[PDB]
Amino acid sequence: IEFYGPNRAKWLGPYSENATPAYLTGEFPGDYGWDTAGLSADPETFKRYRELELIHARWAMLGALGCITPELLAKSGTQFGEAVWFKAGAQIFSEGGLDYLGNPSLVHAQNIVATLAVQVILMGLVEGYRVNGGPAGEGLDPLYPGESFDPLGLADDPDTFAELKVKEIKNGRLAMFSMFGFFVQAIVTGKGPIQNLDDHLSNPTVNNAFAFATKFTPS
Amino acid sequence: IEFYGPNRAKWLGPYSENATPAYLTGEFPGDYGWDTAGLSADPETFKRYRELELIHARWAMLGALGCITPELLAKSGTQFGEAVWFKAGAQIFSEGGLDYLGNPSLVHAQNIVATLAVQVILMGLVEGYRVNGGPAGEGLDPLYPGESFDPLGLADDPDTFAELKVKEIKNGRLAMFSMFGFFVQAIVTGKGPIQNLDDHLSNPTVNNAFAFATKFTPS
Amino acid sequence: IEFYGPNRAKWLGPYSENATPAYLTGEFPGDYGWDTAGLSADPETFKRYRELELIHARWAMLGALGCITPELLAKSGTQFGEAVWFKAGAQIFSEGGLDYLGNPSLVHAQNIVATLAVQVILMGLVEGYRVNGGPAGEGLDPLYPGESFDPLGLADDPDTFAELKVKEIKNGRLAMFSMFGFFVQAIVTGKGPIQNLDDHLSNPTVNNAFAFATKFTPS
Ligand code: CHL
Ligand code: CHL
Ligand code: CLA
Ligand code: CLA
Ligand code: CLA
Ligand SMILES: CC(=C/C=C/C(C)=C/C=C/C=C(C)/C=C/C=C(\C)C=C=C1C(C)(C)C[C@H](O)C[C@@]1(C)O)/C=C/[C@@]12O[C@]1(C)C[C@@H](O)CC2(C)C
Ligand SMILES: CC1=C[C@H](O)CC(C)(C)[C@H]1/C=C/C(C)=C/C=C/C(C)=C/C=C/C=C(C)/C=C/C=C(C)/C=C/C1=C(C)C[C@H](O)CC1(C)C
Ligand SMILES: CC1=C[C@H](O)CC(C)(C)[C@H]1/C=C/C(C)=C/C=C/C(C)=C/C=C/C=C(C)/C=C/C=C(C)/C=C/C1=C(C)C[C@H](O)CC1(C)C
Ligand SMILES: CC1=C[C@H](O)CC(C)(C)[C@H]1/C=C/C(C)=C/C=C/C(C)=C/C=C/C=C(C)/C=C/C=C(C)/C=C/C1=C(C)C[C@H](O)CC1(C)C
Secondary structure, three states, rough: OOOOOOOOOOOOHHHOOOOOOOOOOOOOOOOOOOOOOOOOOHHHHHHHHHHHHHHHHHHHHHHHHHHHHHHHHHHHHHOOOOOOOOOOOOOOOOOOEHHHHHHOOOOOOOHHHHHHHHHHHHHHHOOOOOOHHHOOOOOOOOOOOOOOOOOOOOOOOOOHHHHHHHHHHHHHHHHHHHHHHHHHHHHOOOOOOHHHHHHHHHHOOOOOOOOOOOOOOOO | OOOOOOOOOOHHHOOOOOOOOOOOOOOOOOOOOOOOOOOOOOOHHHHHHHHHHHHHHHHHHHHHHHHHHHHHHHOOOOOOOOOOOOOOOOOOOOOOOOOOHOOOOOHHHOOHHHHEEEEEEEHHHHHHHHHHHOOOOOOOOOOOOOOOOOOOOOOOOHHHHHHHHHHHHHHHHHHHHHHHHHHHHHOOOOOOHHHHHHHHHHHOOOOOOOOOOOOOOOO | OOOOOOOOOOOOOOOOOOOOOOOOOOOOOOOOOOOOOOOOOOHHHHHHHHHHHHHHHHHHHHHHHHHHHHHHHHHHHHOOOOOOOOOOOOOOOOOOOOOHHOOOOOOOEEHHHEEEHOOOOOOOOOOHHHHHHHOOOOOOOOOOOOOOOOOOOOOOHHHEEEEEHHHHHHHHHHHHHHHHHHHHHHHHHOOOOOHHHHHHHHHHOOOOOOHHHOOOOOO
């Protein structure tokens, strides 16, 4: 319970090998000291890796929640068409464009190339202004700004804020691994991941993983 | 990102010809140094042009939003009759006067000459009191007053206020150019501009502009 | 028109953001300052990237001309069999080995493992002697030697030689991007790229790209 210090929860716990690599000793969230290959020895490259991992973690968390929500919403009391995240990308082609919420009173996007061009414009703008700053105050911090992106004001107390940093990083790692699980389930079985959840909760041991283990057999 | 200074985003960027005309060097929003004819060499006439351009920009922005909103509102979930801005001016003549929102429980203006006379009276009053001041404090500034027209109080911090000035001017220029586009679409094809939007999004390249290029052919 | 200097044609030209990364300011061809990720901050690794990009550029230019020539030659007045670069690699297996120019009086390579072994021997020799030098004078420059590889003598005048450097790098970048296009056309449509050229020149807009956009649809 001492991540910011030498007594952090190390990568093997009581198999910790307390001779840790000296280029990271606490002082940054998520430092669990698991460097078996050591691709981040250089400090500026290490900083790039911190920024890159933060970006990956936030994007992956957003995608993971986006993979949990719509299927459950369409399973509970709404209808989307194909709420499973495979053909949600092809819902614009099928019959009447991509109707949001499965309702012909919402977005109803007919042409995907318009989404394409506007998306490129907006994403270029937001990513450029993410790197170099811009609106809502010029960006002075590349890792965590501290400017008007926290309209509630939770970043006053420092140690709870650092605990929030560590929770953010751990949640992002879990989100990245879980989205890898989503992608592998997309490959192997190619069905709904929450359909997978229901089917495994209905079938705990008879259809576990290895009925789907003789599919990609070369011959 | 330095509009208020010699390092403003000039009219050609890195084709800037940094020998700019010396009668404008920053210190005013929208100064992009593009004076190829030079019709504003005199300083008082230049001030007139700043005031005139501000008036044109605000009026054109109002008109542009007025050209985007009603068609979308009548396309989504309401009905107006002719929501396209052509015969919206003739909606008072058709059958039952100009019913607002397409509802016979709202304005229901029967005689257009009454709108005419009251509009002249009100417009004369508001423009005279715009020039020379009057209510809500006497007008001491012709460009931006600073009196009780900003009930929220966003004009405290000066540099963000200047950035707001520049955004206002750029939005006004875009609005003027876009309303010119609206007028040219009114002339050439004479159909709904958002109907144009939907048709070009449905037809990106087969009906682009030059099917409507052999209409005004003299003979 | 000033690549060797601060006034180079930067990556956005008129959106240049003249605060360029300081680890490259001219003095080398192809320096267009477009470092959004920054994977070449280290100077020796940057040198490796210059050498590597030169090798890639020359190899890709050779491959690109090798992808333009034979199809056109077999389309104009000669015959090769499959002049399209797909089965040109399998022309040794088909009936009578790989006959050069489509003529049974030229190379007529029967066994591909002989080409294989001789190719490995020759390529190991030339690549080793490329790295460490050797014949025709020992290699003293890893980037551009200056020894007897320019039997015409165009490297006397320095500024024209530097312009040749920049042309070489730009041609190489274009060749790499174009060969990527060749590979993507090999994947998606799997037909002749110059057959693609003729078909798009015959069909400019009816078969553009998105008839070939519903092929790799998962289900
Ligand atoms: C449109 C312009 C645009 C521009 C200029 C940038 C620019 C940038 N982005 Mg951004 N992005 C843009 C659009 C978008 N980005 C993202 C998502 C991200 C993420 C998630 C991240 C960035 C990052 C970055 C930075 C460097 C990334 C890089 O080197 O890419 C090179 C990479 C590729 C060309 C593709 C790499 C694919 C990857 C290997 C996936 C491999 C998949 C797995 C192996 C598993 C696959 C399936 C499963 C089942 C096994 C750079 C500033 C990174 C960053 O800021 O780090 C500090 C970062 O982490 N961008 C999305 C969402 C789709 C965009 C949509 O338009
Ligand atoms: C036979 C022995 C042989 C030896 C010892 C070398 C040795 C060397 N070569 Mg050479 N080569 C040899 C044969 C050949 N080379 C080349 C072509 C090249 C090129 C083009 C380059 C070198 C380079 C190098 C140097 C380091 C490259 C490396 O790290 O590879 C690791 C790489 C791989 C194992 C394969 C990488 C594949 C790559 C990722 C392709 C990805 C494809 C795209 C994503 C797109 C694909 C399809 C499209 C449609 C999307 C190294 C001195 C590089 C250099 O000198 O840089 C300064 C360099 O740029 N070699 C060819 C032509 C096929 C050879 C044929 O025999
Ligand atoms: C691309 C995503 C990515 C990136 C850049 C990083 C980056 C980093 N991680 Mg990290 N991590 C990730 C995903 C990622 N992580 C995921 C998904 C998990 C959960 C499994 C973890 C769990 C983890 C732990 C437990 C620790 C780190 C640590 C680190 C730091 C040092 C290690 C390093 O140099 O990594 C460089 C990484 C790369 C260059 C990415 C290479 C990716 C290629 C494609 C190979 C991946 C193949 C993979 C092994 C096959 C199975 C995939 C499956 C497991 C998902 C560095 C900031 C250590 C640290 O000190 O934290 C700050 C540490 O203790 N990570
Ligand atoms: C009538 C509207 C109007 C007026 C009075 C001004 C006034 C001004 N603009 Mg301006 N501008 C406008 C509309 C207008 N603008 C629009 C719509 C755009 C976008 C295309 C711009 C883009 C623009 C830039 C990029 C710059 C200016 C600048 C200036 C200032 C110096 C130039 C000058 O003396 O203009 C005098 C203008 C007139 C006397 C108007 C004459 C109008 C007649 C009918 C001719 C128009 C015909 C037209 C060319 C045909 C195509 C129309 C189509 C492009 C819409 C001055 C304050 C410069 C500056 O320093 O900013 C402060 C500068 O750098 N403007
Ligand atoms: C592998 C090929 C390769 C390599 C090693 C380089 C290397 C370099 N380029 Mg470069 N470039 C290339 C291909 C390549 N280029 C191509 C094909 C284009 C045309 C699109 C360009 C256009 C370009 C510009 C405009 C600029 C550079 C610059 C640079 C330098 C700094 C950037 C850097 O660190 O790159 C490191 C690169 C790599 C480590 C390669 C990673 C490759 C992986 C597979 C990711 C690629 C995925 C790709 C984005 C997906 C779409 C591919 C499609 C666009 C082809 C460096 C010497 C900058 C400079 O200063 O020039 C000297 C600069 O301004 N390049
Ligand atoms: C109206 C008109 C305009 C011409 C436009 C041109 C010439 C565009 C070419 C435009 C071509 C241009 C600009 C190319 C210019 C090349 C340059 C600058 C070279 C360069 C570079 C860079 C950037 C690498 C930078 C490097 O560091 C230095 C340097 C020097 O290497 C033509 C009309 C006619 O063609 C018709 C219509 C019908 C005919 O019958 C009659 C006529 C009159 C001839
Ligand atoms: C550390 C280390 C160390 C040692 O030394 C070495 C090694 C081992 C190599 C290393 C490792 C590495 C790794 C593992 C990595 C991984 C990563 C990942 C997983 C990522 C993900 C990542 C991921 C991510 C980002 C994701 C993202 C996502 C997204 C956006 C999504 C989207 C979406 C959504 C919403 C929904 C819809 O409907 C669809 C989609 C489209 C689906
Ligand atoms: C700068 C310069 C420089 C150089 O040197 C020379 C030159 C070139 C000459 C110059 C230029 C100029 C120009 C271009 C100008 C333009 C302008 C414009 C466009 C305006 C508009 C302008 C415009 C405007 C105001 C507008 C306004 C509008 C409005 C009110 C509207 C109204 C409406 C609405 C609401 C709706 C309904 O249903 C109808 C209507 C009725 C429709
Ligand atoms: C710069 C940067 C920056 C930022 O920061 C980040 C990023 C974006 C990542 C980066 C980028 C990168 C990139 C893009 C790369 C690319 C590359 C390429 C494309 C290469 C090619 C490359 C390519 C190449 C070499 C090629 C080569 C080729 C060859 C040999 C060929 C051969 C051949 C021939 C003759 C013909 C026959 O019949 C067949 C064949 C076999 C076909």
